[PDB]
Design a protein around this ligand. Structure first.
Ligand SMILES: O=C(O)CCCc1ccccc1
Ligand SMILES: O=C(O)CCCc1ccccc1
Lengths: 301, 301
């Protein structure tokens, strides 16, 4: 049910009176959360906030906020229904945002004086963005009749099965560039099943696997046909879920340790999403051997 | 040669004129470093600093400082020689100190109001103590004719060989209580050899192995004859040395995470020695599976 500063509705109605309360809530919350993001764009240093791409994303939000406010209060099913259509448009229009931001800010490196100030902007924007798209997709999900799912929430989610999905996805991206990809072994609580929201995992994991596999391959150019396995370990307790990802790609060099976590661009975002959801994302480099990555995600309650 | 706030002499003389400079330095430095420790005892909260055991250790230092100052300047070989005899007495008299402290402070738990204040006292005392005993033993070591050793410094130290020593030591302590002990496998840079000082390792390692083995055994009471291996990984680069110690003893429970690193009593001391020498000691608990421990030690220069 609950989430940081927001609620994901666990409710059921044969007549769909839950979709009213859900949408009624969404229409109260969404505009507020968007507005907070607009203050954040306004607070940007002039020099940066002026860069056209940043300025475009800035506009997108103003547009979204207009559209949401303009939409009239929901008093019946048909309202809610057409509301869903908006949320769909919005989700599609903002789908490339994180990319735009990245380039908006890449163009804008030189004029960057205070780093902490932007890293904060990004964290607050990218994560606050997540929460929005989660809350939105949860709602749309309430219309689906999918089994084992209350909204976007799995009732019986297997960490193993979902890691495997992202593995095949990552193996493929990888094989294509290097001709091979490291075998991936998974141990620990591989039979674990429990209520959870795939969405966060759906961003983060392919990030970590892409790295694990990239580093592994990049360090064995001589023997791409025989590379050390990527070892994933799952630990499920009553507090949170840990997923450790071990690679043997010589680890992140000492100098790069600072630079790697700061905003190639995928780890800092993953750390942010993790912290946002009451979890974390820690690194252990073993220079000369490999890297171990620890992702913790709080259990839902 | 160098060390934090102190120098370990790399020098050679057929006539032993190095033992003069060495001792001349020791006799300048030792009294200063002891005096700093006495200010630390004086700064203790009255209530604690009054506890007889703390008071005894307090006295020991005053005694040591007397003895060192009283000893007359070294102008010849025979001076230095009898100086060595003092340092030997001192090293023996202060050998049980860390234990005394621990009990001095255990008796004194109730009257503890500011924790950070004592944890700091301990870190500064135990580590500053290390440096003293290192500097002292280095000197005495300069008299030995041992090959591959300049003082207490190994010229060709194998992390593997030294871990193995502490493993056999830990296996034994362990087998005695549980009847078995986990096999220990070592990977990574197992052929690494390089200049180093065994001493720090000689404290720390048996600590970590004792834990790795304790946890492993304590979690497999049903099958002590078949327990998951302890996996040690060595990573040697040009900056520092990493030793990772992985166990499968279900890890440190969430609640205990805070308590475990604070002053059973062996980890906090190990973290302190590590930091002191420009290294660190990090933990990764995987609740339900095990713990991974990362020890970094700067390379000598
Ligand atoms: O996703 C973003 O970039 C910002 C959110 C846009 C949006 C709002 C409400 C519902 C759906 C989407
Ligand atoms: O070891 C301690 O507890 C404090 C050091 C005592 C000592 C001083 C000089 C040389 C040898 C020993």
């Amino acid at each position: 049910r609950l989430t940081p500063t927001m609620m994901l509705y666990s409710g059921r109605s044969q007549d769909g009176s839950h979709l009213l309360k859900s949408g009624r809530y969404l229409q109260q919350e969404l505009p507020v959360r968007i507005a907070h993001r607009i203050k954040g764009f306004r607070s940007l240093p002039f020099i940066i906030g002026c860069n056209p791409t940043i300025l475009h994303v800035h506009e997108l939000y103003i547009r979204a906020f207009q559209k949401l406010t303009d939409f009239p209060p929901i008093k019946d099913q048909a309202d809610e229904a057409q509301y869903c259509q908006l949320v769909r448009q919005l989700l599609d229009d903002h789908k490339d945002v994180v990319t735009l931001l990245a380039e908006g800010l890449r163009e804008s490196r030189k004029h960057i004086e205070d780093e902490k100030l932007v890293r904060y902007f990004l964290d607050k924007t990218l994560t606050s963005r997540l929460g929005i798209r989660m809350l939105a997709t949860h709602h749309l999900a309430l219309h689906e009749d999918k089994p084992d799912f209350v909204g976007i929430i799995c009732t019986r989610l297997s960490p193993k099965k979902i890691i495997e999905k992202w593995v095949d996805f990552a193996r493929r991206l990888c094989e294509h560039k290097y001709g091979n990809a490291p075998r991936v072994r998974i141990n620990g609580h591989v039979a674990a099943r429990f209520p959870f929201i795939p969405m966060p995992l759906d961003y983060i994991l392919p990030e970590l696997l892409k790295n694990a596999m990239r580093a592994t391959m990049e360090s064995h150019l001589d023997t791409p046909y025989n590379v050390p396995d990527v070892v994933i370990t799952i630990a499920n307790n009553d507090v949170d879920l840990i997923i450790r990802i071990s690679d043997r790609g010589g680890g992140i060099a000492h100098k790069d340790l600072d630079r790697v976590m700061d905003y190639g661009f995928g780890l800092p975002t993953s750390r942010a999403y993790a912290e946002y959801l009451g979890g974390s994302l820690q690194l252990q480099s073993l220079q000369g051997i490999g890297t171990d990555v620890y992702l913790r995600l709080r259990h839902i309650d």
